């Protein structure tokens, strides 16, 4: 299996890798039908999302999209910096695929 | 507890998260490298500010030697606190560590190596006009049952960390000579004597950590996810 | 998809953006039959409800109610601040939508 | 709709409303076969439980009571104080319906 | 309903009191097939396991094994000291059916 | 059952022990299809990774794979010591069997 996230992104199509190295400014989350999803934005202007679970996620894919959702709140609230985000750009704000930080 | 006078006001030291040392912003950024160094620490003297150079910050035994001090060297201030913190073994006791080489003796300094957690801090009080205002107030975020029974750190584990310089006989003496850092009593000294320092404040920021983040641990039904 | 928690909240009808900017002064939480829901007040008087999930929620809302309520009893412990809250109007007390936090 | 935990109380039976305004002194849960449940007591000499779930508990209570368990240990371990608790007194200890908690 | 650890310990067979008064010293948590379990052990020198589910579990103990697990690692991380734990002292080590704290 | 880390390592095939002692370096978290794991390094250069779920998993062992990614993260932030790791070493990087902390 993959060693870095970098690697790890690399073996998906419409991926890029960003180096934020920066905690996360703020955290939405929303309950809305249709629209259940976290947004997260960074003190440069990037904004991510995990996006809603629909048909381009197999199975396996659900309950890690519920553990990203824990990871990105408890990453805000402790203000914990993040490094790097594979995310696919194919989406508007680009999804996240996975996450790193480093200590 | 202990006491500190300081013009820094609750929520400054809120949003770094502690009182901090000459240089640090906020209480976990190893993004700075601090300088920790007792000796050069009871030494050194500050304008405006009780001694808290060199990755430490000091603090005095009693409320009325902190105002004491506050009134000596913040004489000219409408408002400054004095801040009253729980013991714990990030504190260490200048007399004891640095011995009959303790620097300013009589004014009896314990001092906190990397700072004061916000989360270790009891409260403080108001200073008008160097006139203390006798009501305490309390700081929410004190973990009380965690710092309930924690006690300064004992003499014994600072020696190490005591920061004398290389060829400054207390190396070569008892008790420092049993603790000496690797090349005390070449450069080896000091960045040994830096790095023992910095471990020492890497493993009570985790102690830290573990209190102050696990109240954002969520935990998750298992068996409704698989 | 939505950036903002603005931009998400007006894509529904009945809803309304309330700018908190600040922390939660009670957390009320109930496990009595029928009335399984949580509910939260603020210095200025407003209260919020997080609504007992029911037939006004699709399937994919449920996990997104019960991930609501984590959220707000984590801010309530730790006296995070609460940036703007999107509710639908329509509900006594008003429901939660979506969340936003910042800093 | 309930604004309040004593509206929230009164519209249930055996129901009573108890103003704690202190922290949890002990927690104490157990996995044991038919005793699977939490208990609390306070410094004042009262002590209440978290029923095992069983056939007075409907299907959208299941969920509830996994929640409030889970709120009992998180308030226990941060020494939040509670305000008050709804509970069903035809119980031996009180049973909890609903708490509260401020500031 | 049992409203101590010693009264509910004592509605069991082979069990016992254990009064530890003290912080968990070590945990071990392992994820092996045959093994999902967690061992969690004293400066006194004691050990105890939360038990792999199995047949001497009824239903409603699977949920309650994943809680107490979940309780051993936050007791673990935060440092806070168990009170009392009620065993099964006919397994090796000694099987958890309840823990107290009290502060 | 085991009483230690290693005396559980011991009863698979193909694993060995490895003693850390030391907080985790980085911590990499992906929900990408077919790559949902995480994985985490050291300052000595070692890589470790919780497998994704597959054929190699007996059905108990879902449940804690889930948990082991859950304590792995809460360990990393809160920079707490690993004292020892049980490993399969026939995968790469080496997959997480058990984990143990102390003090
Ligand atoms: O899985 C989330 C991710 O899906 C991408 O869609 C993939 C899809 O997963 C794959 O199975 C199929 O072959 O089509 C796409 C190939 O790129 C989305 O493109 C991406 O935005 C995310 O939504
Ligand atoms: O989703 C909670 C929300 O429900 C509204 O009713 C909507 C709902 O948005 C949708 O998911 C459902 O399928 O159709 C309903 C159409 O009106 C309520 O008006 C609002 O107050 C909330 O309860
Ligand atoms: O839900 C817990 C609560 O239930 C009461 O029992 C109710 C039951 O919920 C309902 O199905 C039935 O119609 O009426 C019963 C009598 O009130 C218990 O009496 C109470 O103590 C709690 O256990
Ligand atoms: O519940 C865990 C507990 O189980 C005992 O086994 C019992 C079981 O609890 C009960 O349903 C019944 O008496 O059958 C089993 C026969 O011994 C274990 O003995 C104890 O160590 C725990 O494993
Ligand atoms: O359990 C994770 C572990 O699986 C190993 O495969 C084992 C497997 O557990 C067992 O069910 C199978 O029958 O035999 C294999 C060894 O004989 C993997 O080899 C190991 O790396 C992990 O993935």
Redesign the interface.
Known sequence: ?????TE?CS??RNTQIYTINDKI?????????????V?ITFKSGE?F?????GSQ??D??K?????????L??????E?KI?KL?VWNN???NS???????? | RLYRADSRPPDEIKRSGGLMPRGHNEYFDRGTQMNICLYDHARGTQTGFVRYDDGYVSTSLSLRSAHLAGQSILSGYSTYYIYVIATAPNMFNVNDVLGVYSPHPYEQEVSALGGIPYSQIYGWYRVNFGVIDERLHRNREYRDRYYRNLNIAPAEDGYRLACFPPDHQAWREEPWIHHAPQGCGGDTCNEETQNLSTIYLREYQSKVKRQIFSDYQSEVDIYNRI
Request: glycine share 2%; with cysteine; net charge positive.
């Open positions: 299996a993959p060693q870095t996230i790890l073996e998906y400014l703020s955290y939405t989350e929303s309950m809305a039908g249709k629209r259940e999803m947004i904004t999302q995990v996006e809603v679970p996620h197999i396996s894919q309950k890690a999209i519920e553990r990203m959702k824990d990871t709140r408890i990453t805000y609230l402790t914990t490094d594979c989406k508007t704000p996240i695929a996975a996450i790193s930080m480093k200590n």
